[PDB]
Design a protein around this ligand. Structure first.
Ligand code: CDL
Ligand code: CDL
Ligand code: CDL
Ligand code: CDL
Ligand code: CDL
Ligand code: PC1
Ligand code: 3PE
Ligand code: SF4
Ligand code: F3S
Ligand code: FES
Ligand code: CA
Lengths: 103, 62, 43, 285, 44, 218, 57, 196, 74
């Protein structure tokens, strides 16, 4: 490119590089990035799960790790069914209340 | 001056592409969607494609 | 080698894919405004 | 002194592409002073010519009409007849003349192959086109830059490495006839690169993906019973897409003029890599 | 699946080669988060 | 209903009431066809089975219901003139910017996006980038502008609010015109006694409060 | 319970009935609103003229 | 000091536990190439890699309370802290080399996009001066780096095999005319012969 | 071409924590509690509603400037 535009472009890219480097390596910003990276890693690679590799002999595996799936299913299904029953009960209660109040 | 060497009618990228690509791109689309789309559309119309006219269409202002 | 609850994992992944595709494409919830001209009327 | 040239370069590129599409397969007659009657008795060879050293030269087909009853029936024989009798400036690699060195690998009329052991269509009507290997940089005429092929070949460490000393030093590493026949049909590769220049994965990713030939050599050094760096080689070829990029097209085994089957070797390598990945977890526990 | 899409884009697009495996992983994490958010929100 | 296009109002005595009726009747047929299409879609979808239908009919077919309400209100209004939009600008300064994104009034060009694209083009021209890059950087801001412009169903809610306001205003204006002759004499008497332009309802509410506060109960 | 056709018949009829009741409401409200405006305007005029109140601004 | 007890126990547990793994992680990082040194950890198995990267800073910075430490325990903690600091420096070095590798690969990618067959819109016959200067300076820095690694034959060999690959491909991308003799003067000494 | 489709989980995410299986019950408890709270609020808002339409439901309108809204018959 034209050498004047070359000077402008070199200056601009140098400014961009310096800004990025400063923002990343500044003390507080560096600490924030460093902690957030590990938090993101924990969230992504250690999220709650129901399937995992079993490397232990049956004698060396807890019962929790053989019935965790069933406990989770019980909890979720019970929550859904109980919410459904609560919805029905609230429907009946509201209907009865507003009926006895008028018409 | 860009000089291109190309066998239009015999190279793998040529008429063979016209013969090949259209019949292979549309394999899953046809064979899956057409039955699936037909099922989705018809399952509503167990009785018919009837529009229950909620507005008085047969009524015209005098 | 053994994977605890592998079948559960397979079915969960399949269900996740199915639900995501269903909501993204709305394959099952089509639009019929285009068919109205090609439909009979009642009343 | 120079200025921005994005616009001029863009317009020139678009215009040149359009014109080249209009004037693709540009051809120049070597000897225009030929009566059409004579051409009935002579076969036509369209030979790719390009001399990047000369700044005024551009790629082009050159048409040579030759009497096929003056030399033996092979692509290399015709090329050398053209060179010696018609135009001795033609460039091509040739050492062995019997399909062993593998230097003469070229695109002999639509198929990558060794020119020394490949015949050509005897019919005088259909023209024959001889061009260099496709996706290799062209140095001059039918000579391509195979340097990257060799550089990739170097990265597989193709030398017998052994972790156990020889018991007596007055013998030879024992290997039964079965452990030798395991290599039969696998050590005959002449590194012609004809197969690898026909692999689409090698077209797209020449550097990150080793060619079918180099991977076949890695397989040869792996299956060899005398070497003890089996797992190490497997792990080395398991990086990124050095092997994973292969899509089992199978053109490699179809083009191989030696009759080898690099596709099967790559398939076995993939199976071994998968087993290595699984048993790095299963075994160490 | 995601891996395959990234592989195709890398193998066919020359420009896409610019991205590191780290950037690809960041896109993977963002896409997984967005997919989880989509699944959860659609039912709300 | 297949209403005729010829209004039965007298233009000489109720001009605005005649114009409103004329526009309503003119656009009624088209808006009725759209409403019928929407209702047919809704009921056919409700006839579905399980996930394809009933199980999720009322809750997931929300855009269709919103379109139906907008169509019904617009059909009742018929046509909208800029004077009313500027009138409602008091409570919603972006009424025009919202009423453009709900109705197919005029074609919208992403002018801001195209301006940003031209700026990026100038940048590239200065720094000698390939033309492909600058064409892509022209498309990209345009794409962003289009994505942020279309959709935007909140503008449809604001359009519904404005159309309700406009319908109430037009009804009251028609009532004003209908009884204008009857109130001519009373108006002439009133203007000469009260120098205020404030409404009668507001003044009477203030008077009622004044009586309730100061007037002796006795 | 009942075929969908009958359900839509009921829906249309109920919409019509609700519209009829709204018609009654609109008629009565418009009439009485006109009467109310007349009465309030006359009351303000009488108040100002009688000197009971002074309406400024 | 209950909070001090918990802080010190957390630090001890994490630091000592990871110190037993630093060897493995560093070896794996060495094993891969410089394009994505953490490729194995992102794709195959995160063998306490992100844990090391996170806890190196804590080992460097967070304070210690010796009265909560034993004698042998304190010696072990100091050893583990030194190992984590070594890992920090090693990761910094690998990152620097990886970024230099990506500089060279960026140059090569520009050349490849230049010579791509789909590039019907930006086809250039003659290399422009800017990229030539970039190539020359990049090769100069690469030669200086190779010289600086004379005491570490394995590191020098890896740097050659990895980074110089794209220098060789750049060498192959262009004709031997114009300024070519001057641009690749340093490369022609030893490296060019290696990549044949 | 190579076959790659499969429903099996990837070994990259299949690791356990040191003390046992992944934190599944602990997170499911939180999820159930949050769902209970959210759905309870939604149900309470939805079911206990009525529409009362009378004069007292209407108030005097005003501009964003606070003044009373009145539009002339221009
Ligand atoms: C600044 C920080 C950095 C930011 C970076 C930028 C990005 C953001 C990052 C933020 C960090 C979090 C990101 C989200 C997590 C990402 C996870 C991931 O990518 O993993 C990939 C990774 C992929 O691995 P893979 O190898 O591909 O395998 C995946 C397969 O699906 C294999 O799956 P699986 O088989 O292992 O299954 C997984 C498991 C996971 O599920 C669980 O165990 C979890 C359960 C729910 C817990 C919810 C807890 C929520 C707590 C919230 C508390 C409040 C928070 C408030 C915060 C406010 C702010 C402080 O599923 C189940 O448990 C299945 C349950 C099915 C129930 C079925 C019910 C049956 C009922 C009937 C019973 C029987 C009746 C019989 C009747 C018979 C009649 C005849 O996923 C996993 O392996 C883990 C499982 C998936 C977890 C998904 C979690 C998503 C969470 C999204 C949260 C969004 C919140 C937004 C809040 C906004 C506020 C403003
Ligand atoms: C004005 C209007 C204009 C409209 C149009 C505008 C333009 C629109 C965009 C157009 C461009 C789109 C480009 C997409 C490229 C995708 C990659 C590709 O081509 O594949 C190559 C590559 C080929 O691999 P290969 O190794 O050569 O395959 C050979 C093997 O032998 C094969 O191995 P195998 O034989 O063992 O495999 C067995 C087979 C197993 O399957 C089968 O054998 C058959 C399966 C049949 C499934 C039938 C489903 C039916 C229900 C749904 C139907 C919905 C549509 C129809 C609805 C109505 C009618 C029913 O596996 C597969 O088939 C794998 C793929 C299918 C998996 C099933 C799930 C697919 C859907 C995933 C979710 C999509 C969400 C979209 C959200 C979009 C948001 C914007 O495939 C992949 O990459 C696979 C993964 C793809 C994942 C894509 C996920 C979505 C990505 C969204 C973002 C994309 C952004 C793109 C750039 C945008 C502009 C900057
Ligand atoms: C309506 C709603 C809104 C719609 C628009 C939404 C837009 C959202 C934002 C999009 C942002 C795109 C840019 C970022 C992605 C990465 C780009 C990139 O690699 O940057 C560097 C790369 C340039 O690299 P380079 O070093 O200059 O090139 C040399 C390399 O060797 C090149 O190596 P390479 O392999 O990297 O290069 C391949 C390159 C492709 O670039 C190229 O190398 C060539 C591009 C031009 C090709 C033109 C066709 C060539 C002839 C083919 C045969 C056509 C026959 C047609 C007639 C048939 C008759 C039967 O691939 C891409 O660009 C990747 C992404 C492409 C898809 C996303 C963009 C879609 C834009 C669609 C609208 C375009 C404007 C309107 C056009 C129509 C006006 C009436 O890309 C650019 O800077 C250009 C970006 C694309 C500009 C538009 C070109 C036309 C594309 C049309 C695609 C149509 C697909 C079908 C569905 C369309 C539905 C709308
Ligand atoms: C809107 C929604 C918001 C919420 C949701 C957000 C969702 C998205 C994710 C967000 C991710 C990014 C977050 C922002 C980045 C923050 C960066 C940062 O902290 O900068 C510090 C960092 C300086 O620290 P440094 O350089 O790393 O350290 C050297 C220093 O000289 C200092 O040396 P030193 O030794 O004097 O002091 C070291 C220590 C202060 O030292 C102490 O006094 C001790 C601190 C606790 C140590 C751990 C004890 C654990 C004991 C067991 C607990 C068990 C609990 C029950 C469970 C049991 C069963 C498992 O100070 C720190 O460095 C604090 C860092 C943050 C906490 C680190 C501890 C993590 C573990 C404990 C909490 C998590 C529970 C784990 C439970 C399981 C454990 C197995 O850089 C700055 O100064 C930047 C300042 C500007 C940025 C913003 C600053 C915000 C400050 C927030 C403080 C929060 C304190 C904890 C509150 C807990 C409430 C319940
Ligand atoms: C709930 C409402 C409030 C939420 C607040 C969230 C605040 C987050 C702030 C984060 C600040 C930066 C943190 C930096 C790291 C410092 C700590 C550390 O290094 O780890 C120490 C400790 C041990 O780490 P390590 O020794 O390195 O172990 C890993 C090694 O690989 C060694 O492994 P190992 O084999 O030796 O085993 C060690 C084991 C040891 O781990 C444990 O012992 C922890 C086990 C769990 C907790 C156990 C205690 C439970 C009781 C706590 C009671 C607290 C009461 C507090 C009262 C306060 C009163 C004022 O480690 C683990 O297993 C790690 C578990 C990681 C879990 C990650 C969960 C991801 C998904 C989250 C969302 C799910 C949504 C599902 C929705 C689905 C709907 C369908 O780990 C943790 O503290 C885990 C924290 C995980 C969550 C952090 C990020 C949460 C983000 C949520 C999404 C929000 C998005 C909002 C939008 C974005 C903008 C706002
Ligand atoms: C709204 C906008 C819509 C616009 C629609 C535009 C459609 C575009 C379709 C493009 C198809 C794919 C080709 C272009 C993109 C290629 C991308 C890629 O990765 O390729 C790189 C590669 C090229 O690069 P390469 O081969 O050098 O590979 C890279 C190798 N290294 C890394 C070493 C450099 O592939 C190609 O580009 C191949 C191009 C083939 C071109 C074929 C043209 C056929 C024309 C047919 C015309 C028929 C007319 C009929 C008229 C009839 C009249 C009666
Ligand atoms: C040139 C152009 C270039 C263009 C480049 C564009 C790149 C775009 C890349 C990003 C987009 C990729 C989209 C891929 C398709 C979507 C697939 C999907 O929905 O799943 C995502 C992911 C699992 O899919 P994937 O990781 O791809 O495959 C794993 C195989 N084992 O799923 C996840 O991991 C998400 C987390 C949840 C997974 C499911 C969890 C189990 C399901 C049950 C949860 C139960 C919760 C509690 C109970 C609720 C119900 C009662
Ligand atoms: S793989 Fe086949 S084509 Fe390639 S060099 Fe060996 S024998 Fe020749
Ligand atoms: S031709 Fe090509 S990609 Fe694979 S198996 Fe054969 S090499
Ligand atoms: S000429 Fe000898 S093998 Fe080719
Ligand atoms: Ca061996």
């Amino acid at each position: 490119m034209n050498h004047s535009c070359q000077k402008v472009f070199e200056g601009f890219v140098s400014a961009l590089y310096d800004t990025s480097y400063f923002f990343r390596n500044f003390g507080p910003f560096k600490a924030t990035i460093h902690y957030a990276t590990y938090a993101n890693y924990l969230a992504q690679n250690w999220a709650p799960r129901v399937s995992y590799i079993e490397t232990s002999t049956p004698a060396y595996t807890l019962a929790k790790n053989k019935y965790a799936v069933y406990i989770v299913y019980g909890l979720i299904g019970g929550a859904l069914i109980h919410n459904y029953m609560l919805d029905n009960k609230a429907a009946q209660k509201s209907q009865q209340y507003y009926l006895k109040h008028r018409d | 001056m860009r000089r291109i060497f190309w066998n239009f009618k015999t190279a793998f990228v040529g008429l063979p592409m016209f013969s090949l690509a259209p019949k292979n791109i549309l394999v899953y689309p046809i064979v899956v969607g057409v039955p699936l789309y037909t099922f989705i559309v018809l399952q509503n119309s167990v009785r018919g494609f009837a529009y229950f006219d909620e507005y008085d269409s047969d009524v015209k202002e005098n | 080698l053994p994977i605890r609850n592998i079948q559960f994992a397979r079915y969960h992944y399949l269900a996740a894919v199915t639900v995501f595709t269903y909501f993204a494409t709305r394959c099952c919830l089509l639009d019929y405004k285009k068919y109205y001209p090609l439909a009979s009327v009642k009343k | 002194a120079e200025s921005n040239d994005a616009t001029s370069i863009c317009l020139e590129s678009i215009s040149g592409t359009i014109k080249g599409l209009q004037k693709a397969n540009y051809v120049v007659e070597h000897n225009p002073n030929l009566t059409s009657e004579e051409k009935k008795h002579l076969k036509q060879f369209l030979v790719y010519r390009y001399n990047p050293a000369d700044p005024h030269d551009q790629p082009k087909y050159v048409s040579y009409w030759c009497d096929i009853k003056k030399f033996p029936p092979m692509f290399l024989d015709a090329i050398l007849y053209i060179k010696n009798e018609l135009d001795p400036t033609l460039s091509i690699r040739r050492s062995c003349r019997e399909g062993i060195c593998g230097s003469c690998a070229v695109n002999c009329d639509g198929l990558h192959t060794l020119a020394c052991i490949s015949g050509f269509n005897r019919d005088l009507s259909k023209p024959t086109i001889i061009t260099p290997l496709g996706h290799m940089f062209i140095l001059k005429d039918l000579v391509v830059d195979m340097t990257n092929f060799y550089a990739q070949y170097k990265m597989i460490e193709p030398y017998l490495k052994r972790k156990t000393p020889k018991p007596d030093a007055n013998k030879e590493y024992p290997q039964s006839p079965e452990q030798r026949a395991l290599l039969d049909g696998l050590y005959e590769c002449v590194l012609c690169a004809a197969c690898s220049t026909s692999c689409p994965s090698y077209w797209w990713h020449p550097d990150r993906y080793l060619g079918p030939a180099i991977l076949q050599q890695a397989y040869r050094w792996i299956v060899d019973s005398r070497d003890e760096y089996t797992q190490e080689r497997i792990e080395r070829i398991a990086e990124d897409v050095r092997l994973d990029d292969c899509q089992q097209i199978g053109m490699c085994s179809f083009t191989c003029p030696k009759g080898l089957n690099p596709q099967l070797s790559l398939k076995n390598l993939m199976d071994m890599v998968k087993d290595f990945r699984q048993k790095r977890i299963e075994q160490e526990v | 699946m995601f891996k395959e899409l990234i592989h195709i884009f890398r193998t066919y697009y020359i420009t896409f080669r610019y991205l590191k495996k780290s950037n690809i992983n960041f896109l993977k994490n963002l896409s997984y988060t967005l997919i989880a958010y989509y699944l959860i929100i659609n039912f709300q | 209903v297949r209403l005729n296009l010829k209004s039965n109002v007298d233009q000489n005595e109720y001009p605005f009431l005649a114009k409103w009726d004329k526009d309503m009747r003119q656009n009624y047929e088209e808006y009725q066809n759209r409403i019928d299409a929407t209702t047919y879609h809704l009921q056919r979808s409700q006839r579905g089975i399980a996930v394809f239908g009933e199980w999720m009919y009322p809750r997931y077919f929300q855009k269709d219901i919103l379109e139906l309400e907008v169509l019904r209100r617009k059909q009742q209004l018929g046509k909208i003139y800029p004077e009313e939009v500027s009138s409602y600008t008091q409570i919603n300064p972006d009424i025009a910017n919202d009423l453009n994104l709900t109705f197919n009034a005029k074609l919208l060009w992403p002018v801001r996006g195209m301006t940003v694209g031209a700026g990026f083009f100038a940048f590239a021209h200065l720094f000698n980038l390939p033309y492909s890059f600058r064409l892509g950087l022209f498309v990209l801001p345009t794409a962003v502008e289009l994505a942020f412009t279309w959709g935007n169903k909140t503008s449809q809610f604001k359009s519904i609010e404005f159309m309700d306001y406009l319908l109430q205003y037009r009804v009251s204006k028609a009532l004003l015109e209908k009884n204008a002759k009857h109130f001519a004499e009373k108006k002439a008497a009133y203007q000469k006694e009260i120098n205020s332009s404030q409404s009668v309802q507001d003044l009477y509410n203030q008077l009622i409060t004044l009586v309730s506060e100061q007037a002796p109960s006795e | 319970m009942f075929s969908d056709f009958n359900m839509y018949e009921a829906k249309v009829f109920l919409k019509a009935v609700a519209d009829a009741q709204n018609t009654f409401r609109q008629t009565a409200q418009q009439e009485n609103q006109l009467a109310r405006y007349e009465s309030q305007s006359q009351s303000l005029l009488n108040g100002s003229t009688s000197g009971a109140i002074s309406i400024t601004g | 000091s209950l909070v001090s007890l918990f802080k010190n126990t957390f630090l001890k547990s994490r630091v000592i536990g990871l110190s037993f793994q630093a060897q493995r992680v560093m070896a794996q990082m060495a094993k891969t190439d410089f394009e994505n040194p953490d490729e194995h950890f992102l794709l195959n198995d995160a063998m306490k890699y992100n844990e090391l990267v996170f806890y190196g800073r804590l080992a460097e910075n967070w304070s210690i309370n010796p009265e909560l430490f034993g004698k042998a325990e304190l010696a072990k903690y100091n050893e583990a802290k030194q190992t984590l600091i070594d890992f920090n420096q090693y990761h910094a070095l690998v990152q620097n080399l990886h970024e230099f590798y990506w500089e060279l690969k960026t140059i090569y990618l520009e050349l490849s996009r230049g010579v791509a067959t789909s590039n019907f819109h930006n086809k250039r016959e003659v290399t422009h001066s800017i990229i030539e200067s970039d190539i020359k300076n990049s090769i100069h820095k690469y030669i200086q780096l190779i010289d600086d690694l004379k005491d570490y034959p394995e590191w020098q060999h890896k740097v050659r095999e990895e980074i110089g690959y794209y220098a060789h491909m750049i060498y192959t991308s262009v004709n031997h005319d114009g300024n070519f003799p001057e641009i690749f003067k340093e490369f022609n000494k030893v490296d060019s012969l290696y990549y044949f | 071409a190579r076959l790659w489709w499969t429903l099996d989980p990837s070994k990259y995410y299949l690791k356990q924590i040191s003390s046992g299986g992944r934190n599944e019950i602990l997170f499911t408890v939180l999820g159930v509690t949050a769902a209970y709270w959210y759905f309870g609020n939604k149900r309470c808002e939805h079911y206990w509603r009525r529409q009362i339409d009378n004069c007292q439901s209407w108030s005097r309108a005003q501009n964003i400037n606070g003044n009373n809204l009145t539009v002339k018959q221009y």
